[PDB]
């Protein structure tokens, strides 16, 4: 077994902490047991892990999870709400070959929403569920119990985990609600990274990233807004404040409407990045294996497919997917004594109404 403690920092996350403990073999059962928790400016998460890598003789794994999660949306630069949740996951893992693995699982989650600041898109989802709270009060509550079928696919042919120079990584994760759940929806996420070395020593690499998200309701319901996709920040569209890209809250009057610059995410998302990895100027060859310079072009959009631009014609059409943000800049990664580090400086050359800018972004990791 082992335990660990992490400390880190990010521009969007603030000072972050992590700790965990794992019993390598829980009293002869062969199921590894673990307890992990992490915390940053807007999220507190904890779990109990219970996994066995050889549930069957030929590799199939059996995984259990029991989790608690506290999410402060205002501190993740969204319109304000509080989501406290807990649940369990049972996941089977099937390695198809050397570069592919599949996973299927059944999950239960309880979400307890509170402290929701009235806005059109959020309330629209509440209306689809049959919930009609006051539009002038921030002292509300919404609770749901959901059962989900979760599938996943990971392709990994990366030459190296730290600082890849060749190969691709693809991760597709989906879920759908099982009838009987309070929510009725599906949700799909696709992430890709492709490294192409353009020189023999693999110091000059071209990197293409894509990230896609789509989900909608079933049966006249919508997707819960706390399941929304976002874009902007250090890992999606650099130079943009975290989560700023996409629809903005259209606030209900307190006790007619008000446009805002508070992003609310959305149920469709698309991000793409083109990055040129180079050797690092002004650093010795002794410290090459531990640093990575790159120059990038980032873009992304987020939209709300159920935005009703008829009822709200005086506002921007938030269902519009074509308002594509763009940025360009230089990044620096360093495997520092304080852990994996990442500087980035980016100029958002293409931005839209209410998009907030974060030119300098900085991250020290706490997991590696």
């Amino acid at each position: 077994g082992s335990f660990n403690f992490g400390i880190g920092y990010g521009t969007e996350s603030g000072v972050s902490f992590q700790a965990g403990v794992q019993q390598d073999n829980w009293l002869g059962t062969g199921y590894a047991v673990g307890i992990n928790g992490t915390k940053n400016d807007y999220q507190t998460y904890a779990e109990l892990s219970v996994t066995n890598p050889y549930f069957t003789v030929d590799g199939v794994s059996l995984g259990g999870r029991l989790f608690y999660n506290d999410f402060q949306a205002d501190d993740a630069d969204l319109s304000d709400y509080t989501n406290k949740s807990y649940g369990t996951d049972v996941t089977l893992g099937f390695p198809i070959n050397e570069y592919n693995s599949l996973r299927a699982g059944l999950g239960y989650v309880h979400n307890s929403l509170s402290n929701m600041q009235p806005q059109v898109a959020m309330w629209r989802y509440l209306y689809s569920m049959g919930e009609h709270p006051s539009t002038s009060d921030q002292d509300n509550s919404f609770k749901t119990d959901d059962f989900t079928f979760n599938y996943g696919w990971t392709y990994n042919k990366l030459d190296r985990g730290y600082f890849p120079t060749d190969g691709s990584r693809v991760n597709l994760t989906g879920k759908v609600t099982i009838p009987g759940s309070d929510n009725e929806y599906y949700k799909v996420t696709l992430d890709t990274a492709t490294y192409v070395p353009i020189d023999d020593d693999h110091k000059w690499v071209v990197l293409g990233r894509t990230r896609w998200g789509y989900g909608d309701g079933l049966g006249g319901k919508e997707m819960p807004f706390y399941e929304n996709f976002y874009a902007g920040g250090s890992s999606t569209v650099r130079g943009f404040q975290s989560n700023t890209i996409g629809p903005k809250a259209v606030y209900f009057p307190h006790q007619d409407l008000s446009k805002s610059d508070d992003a609310v995410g959305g149920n469709a998302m698309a991000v793409a990045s083109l990055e040129f990895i180079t050797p690092t100027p002004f650093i010795s060859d002794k410290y090459a294996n531990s640093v990575r310079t790159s120059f990038f072009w980032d873009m992304g959009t987020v939209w709300d497919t159920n935005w009703d631009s008829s009822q709200y014609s005086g506002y921007p059409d938030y269902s519009d997917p074509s308002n594509i943000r763009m940025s360009a800049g230089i990044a620096l990664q360093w495997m520092s004594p304080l852990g994996p580090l990442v500087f980035s400086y980016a100029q958002p050359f293409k931005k839209y109404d209410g998009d907030k800018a974060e030119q300098f972004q900085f991250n020290i990791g706490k997991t590696w």
């Binding site: 077994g1 082992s2 335990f3 660990n4 403690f5 992490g6 400390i7 880190g8 992590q18 004594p337 304080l338 852990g339 020290i364 990791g365 706490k366 997991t367 590696w368």
Partner: peptide, 7 residues
Amino acid sequence: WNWSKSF
């Protein structure tokens, strides 16, 4: 930073 201590 991450510190890992096998017991």
